[PDB]
């Protein structure tokens, strides 16, 4: 039946999702010979997208009735992403439906669709707020494929890039009800090469007036490709 050694090889021919065993995997046998072995749909541990050149794990199954050896229980190896050249992005599982879900992306504004079949690890469960790494493909329909679980505290949606930066309020934030503005905001001008940066009333205690000197921290919001001034406070000693 199935051999017990964990074999390592590369995908020579991917499966066409758009011959019962059309796939091909090239590996090095224990006797240092180069071997090609076929595989089919059920030979992958999950219905995820395998690609030409992917490093994979598999077990060798011998079918005496079909008179051929087969690669089975194929799983994608993480080392592929170190040599793949594909764009790997980060995010967290935002919602879970039946068969699909949506991810909150680090570098993208919109929620990203993803099929449950693209989760690489079939040994563990998926939950909300799971930190994941994926590859985005386009078909105007976007989806995340080859989704890998990330260790805790690996995903940061915003980064502190500077602290105690000083500038001048060149457009006061709109005098605002209970809901906090997150679109209009104000404008702070600082020469830290003069630059502008947006601030919002939610990120200051006591709103600064137009033309007043302020001190603030700068955070990089990656999904918006912009920085935001927070912890805004007035400066008396200029
Ligand atoms: C678009 Hg994520
Ligand atoms: C230092 C006055 Hg905006």
Author numbering: 3 to 20, 28 to 148, 156 to 192, 194 to 209, 212 to 257
Quote the passages of the study that discuss this structure, keeping the authors' original sentences.
Here, we address this challenge by presenting the results of our comprehensive and systematic investigation of Upstream of N-Ras (Unr), an RBP with multiple RBDs and a model system for understanding sequence specificity of modular RBDs toward target RNAs. In Drosophila, Unr (dUnr) performs sex-specific roles during dosage compensation. In female flies, dUnr, together with Sex-lethal (Sxl), represses translation of Male-specific lethal 2 (Msl2), the rate-limiting component of the dosage compensation complex (DCC) (Abaza and Gebauer, 2008; Abaza et al., 2006; Duncan et al., 2006), whereas in male flies, dUnr has an opposite role and acts together with the RNA helicase Maleless (Mle) presumably as an RNA chaperone to remodel the lncRNA roX2 (RNA on X 2), which promotes the assembly of the DCC (Militti et al., 2014). Although reported to contain five ssRNA-binding cold-shock domains (CSDs), we demonstrate that Unr includes an additional four CSDs that do not bind RNA (pseudo-RBDs) but are involved in mediating RNA tertiary structure specificity by reducing the conformational heterogeneity of Unr.
In the crystal structure of CSD456, interdomain contacts between CSD5 and both ncCSD4 and ncCSD6 are clearly discernable and mediated by F477 on ncCSD4; L505, T521, R533, Q538, E547, L549, and R582 on CSD5; and F593, N663, and R662 on ncCSD6. These contacts appear to keep the domains at a certain distance and orientation to each other. The fit between experimentally observed scattering densities and back-calculated scattering densities from the crystal structure (χ of 1.02; SASBDB: SASDHJ7) strongly suggests that the fixed domain arrangement seen in the crystal structure is maintained in solution. Also, electron density in the corresponding region in ncCSD4 and ncCSD6 was weak or absent in X-ray diffraction data of CSD456, indicating flexibility. CSD456, featuring only one canonical CSD, binds with a KD of 16 μM, comparable with the affinity of CSD1 alone (Hennig et al., 2014a). Similar observations were made for CSD456, where ncCSD4 and ncCSD6 flanking CSD5 do not show major CSPs. We focused our analysis on interdomain residues located in loop regions that lack secondary structure, yet were identified to form interdomain contacts. We generated a series of single mutants as shown in Figure 4A, as well as double and triple mutants as follows: F477A/R582A (referred to as 45 ID given that it disrupts interdomain interactions between CSDs 4 and 5), Q538A/F593A (56 ID, disrupting CSDs 5 and 6 interactions), and L803A/Y865A/I887A (78 ID, disrupting CSDs 7 and 8 interface). Overall, CSD456 and CSD78 mutants displayed decreased stability when compared with wild-type (WT) CSD456 and CSD78, as established by measuring melting temperatures using differential scanning fluorimetry (DSF).
